[PDB]
Design a protein around this ligand. Structure first.
Ligand SMILES: [Mg+2]
Ligand SMILES: [Mg+2]
Ligand SMILES: [Mg+2]
Ligand SMILES: [Mg+2]
Ligand SMILES: [Mg+2]
Ligand SMILES: [Zn+2]
Lengths: 102, 150, 64, 129, 206, 78
RNA sequence: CUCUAACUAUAAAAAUCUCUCUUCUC
């Protein structure tokens, strides 16, 4: 039976979208059923911020960030802990998991 | 008595392919007598033992027999060796067997001489072994020459 | 050389490892007390111990 | 400027055997190439942070002998059609490079990112494991 | 020194100046100090004791094991085999004989020799099982100072035990030899040899 | 049921005159004397280890530190 | 009744299974 009224795709009026590959297993999966995660982070972690600051010329370097949108498959997304199985009454909710920190 | 390593130093060198006779195994790894060199034990790590996944320690170790080996790190203050067995190529084991056989033939000959003369094997090596290895590069080749050319 | 250094724990970050027998702490050097590392300990520790480290660049990574 | 002789650190961290490869400003001149697999035994802990740590210490010693005192970090992932996410070792390589006296300037990420080109390896269903 | 008169005549040496509590009325707990700073507070030479034998609840809470006198912990770790498991007076006698023997060889008040041997024979970096079965290895980690004390005591007693086993020398003499050799860095000692090998193995598996 | 040790007699079951001059000569210069120490030098069987060890308490050749059974602790007389 | 910030990151191998199933009314 229908487990998802949206079918998981989130297409609703296209018929076909262009697939994208998984970052882990390289699964040719449609771009909308290709759960996306925008990893924006520091090129140097908080573990080495002090070390870099003490041992860097150009006092108060901006310490540029790194940006990458990861296109996971769905099997990896279940397994690589990105997305989790949910209650059938919890599948309703599409909001992100409540603002990890405020 | 059997002592006095064939090569230049009692302690080993860096990255020198070695030639082991295993004696016992502990939990950490195998402490193995070195027969290519004089007597000093080497440590073969468990994680660095087998090409295949480790499943049967005694099937591969074969306590009481000889095998090939490679040295990774050495200690030059009191004597300690780190050894590996996984990283041995398909062809290097052949040169290892031939070197073992020739060095063991030389060892047996000179041990026979020392046992007949009751003088420590080190002194007989002092008078015979390494000046010969300096002249020809191999004591066994020089022995064959002495068979032909005196 | 013998670069043996000491490090007094300021906090213990739970117990990690597949065995469940190792712990993870945040150590701060006897010198330069504003410079800290996270390190794995294999044994009973609490706030006050002084670990002995042969390394200083190493940082603890959760054992799985 | 107080005559800080500059180079570019130019770390390359794949998911195995990270690279630390310092060069001059031009980049046509290569010095102190020593890599991660250069210094480890397990043939697979080449990507481990300790391998990159040791490689970074060696390049720091070599370049300090050379005369270069400050370096420019150019972090590169494996790039291309692959995962192009930075390897585990390169981060520790950068930390160890900043540790050993060397001064740090203009960290950059220079990973090669494509315009969705040259179909990825693995087949349609990809690596099944 | 001021022998107190009583209807019962305690020996003079037991009456002399007894605000100077000694271990076996022979060795002074003062003059004994811990060279290493990491293992202080886990070696209990600070308190005085007249016997290396006390029925103390040193195993109720988590960390009272440190507050046990270090000589008492050595005694408790000597009594380790099925054939001799409950016998502790024998262990006290063995430790006493070891202390006099160590006093004979290089006087160096034997409590200091015990402390120095314990400091030296304890490993500073160890390993743990982390391998996920197929890729099973060892993994380098650090040791707690309390576990350093525990492990040093353990290998010292094990070395003494297998030195005494089917051997002419008594257990006290073998323990004294092990303690003397571990006071220095003499690799002939079994405990220091195990320490060195374990630290080397941990180095190999960073 | 083995034969690995291959031990010899390795012990003077009966004391001999030259061995007596020995035990007397290094009666001093052995800064610690015991049964095992005495037999370590191959010159005493082990039962006469106690015999020679007790005999040295004749003219104060060595001094007692403790005389508990199952062993003995003696230092050189100074 | 007034607000848009923090972050990572494991995939070794594991095949198969024979009976026999039995009422609910004050
Ligand atoms: Mg279904
Ligand atoms: Mg979806
Ligand atoms: Mg339409
Ligand atoms: Mg799967
Ligand atoms: Mg009984
Ligand atoms: Zn995938």
């Amino acid at each position: 039976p229908k487990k998802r009224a949206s079918n998981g795709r989130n297409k609703k009026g296209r018929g076909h979208v262009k697939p994208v590959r998984c970052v882990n297993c390289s699964r040719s999966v449609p771009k909308d059923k290709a759960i996306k995660r925008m990893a924006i982070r520091n090129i140097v972690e908080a573990a080495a911020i002090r070390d870099l600051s003490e041992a860097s010329v150009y006092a108060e370097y901006a310490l540029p960030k790194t940006y990458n949108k990861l296109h996971y498959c769905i099997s990896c997304a279940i397994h690589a802990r990105i997305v989790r199985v949910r209650s059938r009454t919890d599948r309703r909710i599409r909001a992100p998991p409540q603002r990890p920190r405020f | 008595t059997s002592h006095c390593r064939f090569y230049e130093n009692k302690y080993p060198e860096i990255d020198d392919i070695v030639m082991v006779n295993v004696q016992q195994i502990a939990e950490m790894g195998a402490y193995v007598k070195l027969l290519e060199y004089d007597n000093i034990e080497g440590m073969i790590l468990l994680s660095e033992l087998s090409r295949r996944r480790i499943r049967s320690i005694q099937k591969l170790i074969r306590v009481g027999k000889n095998d090939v080996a490679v040295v990774l790190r050495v200690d030059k203050e009191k004597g300690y060796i780190d050894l590996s067995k996984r990283r041995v190529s398909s062809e290097d084991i052949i040169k290892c067997e031939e070197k073992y056989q020739k060095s063991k033939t030389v060892h047996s000959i000179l041990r026979y001489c020392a046992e007949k003369f009751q003088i420590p094997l080190e002194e007989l090596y002092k008078t015979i072994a390494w000046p010969l290895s300096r002249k020809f590069g191999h004591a066994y080749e020089a022995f064959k020459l002495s068979i032909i050319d005196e | 050389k013998t670069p043996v250094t000491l490090a007094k724990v300021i906090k213990v970050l739970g117990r990690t490892g597949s065995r469940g027998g190792v712990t993870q702490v945040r150590v701060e050097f006897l010198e330069d007390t504003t410079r800290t590392i996270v390190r794995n300990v294999k044994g009973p520790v609490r706030e006050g111990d002084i670990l002995v480290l042969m390394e200083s660049e190493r940082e603890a990574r959760r054992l799985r | 400027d107080n005559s800080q002789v500059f180079g570019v650190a130019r770390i390359f961290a794949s998911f195995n055997d990270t690279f630390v490869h310092v060069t001059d400003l031009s980049g046509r001149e290569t010095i102190a190439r020593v890599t991660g697999g250069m210094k480890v035994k397990a043939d697979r802990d080449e990507s481990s942070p300790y391998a990159a740590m040791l490689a970074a210490q060696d390049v720091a010693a070599k370049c300090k002998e050379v005369g270069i005192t400050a370096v420019h970090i150019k972090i590169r992932a494996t790039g291309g059609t692959r995962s192009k996410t930075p390897g585990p070792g390169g981060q520790a390589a950068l930390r160890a490079l900043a540790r050993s006296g060397l001064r740090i300037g203009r960290i950059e990420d220079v990973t090669p990112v494509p315009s969705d080109s040259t179909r990825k390896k693995g087949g349609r269903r990809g690596r099944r494991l | 020194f001021v022998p107190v008169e009583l209807a019962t005549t305690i020996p003079v040496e037991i009456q002399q100046a007894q605000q100077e509590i000694k271990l076996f009325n022979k060795w002074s707990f003062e003059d004994v100090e811990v060279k290493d700073a990491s293992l202080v507070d886990y070696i209990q030479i600070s308190k005085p004791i007249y016997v290396a034998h006390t029925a103390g609840r040193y195993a109720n809470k988590r960390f009272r094991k440190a507050q046990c006198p270090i000589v008492e912990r050595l005694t408790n770790s000597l009594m380790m085999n099925g054939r001799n498991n409950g016998k502790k007076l024998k262990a006290v006698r063995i430790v006493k004989h070891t202390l006099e023997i160590i006093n004979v060889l290089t006087d160096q008040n034997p409590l200091q020799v015990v402390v120095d041997a314990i400091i030296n024979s304890g490993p500073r970096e160890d390993t743990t099982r982390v391998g996920g079965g197929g890729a099973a290895r060892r993994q380098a980690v650090d040791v707690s100072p309390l576990r350093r004390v525990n492990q040093s005591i353990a290998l010292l007693t094990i070395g003494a035990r297998e030195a005494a086993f089917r051997n002419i020398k008594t257990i006290a003499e073998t323990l004294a030899e092990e303690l003397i050799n571990a006071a220095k860095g003499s690799s002939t000692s079994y405990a220091i040899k195990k320490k060195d090998e374990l630290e080397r193995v941990a180095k190999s598996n960073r | 049921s083995k034969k690995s040790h291959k031990d010899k007699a390795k012990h003077a079951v009966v004391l001999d005159q030259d061995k007596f001059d020995r035990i007397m000569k290094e009666a001093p210069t052995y800064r610690y004397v015991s049964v095992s120490v005495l037999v370590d030098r191959f010159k005493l069987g082990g039962s006469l280890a106690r015999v020679a060890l007790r005999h040295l308490e004749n003219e104060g050749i060595i001094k007692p530190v403790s005389k508990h059974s199952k062993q003995a602790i003696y230092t050189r007389a100074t």
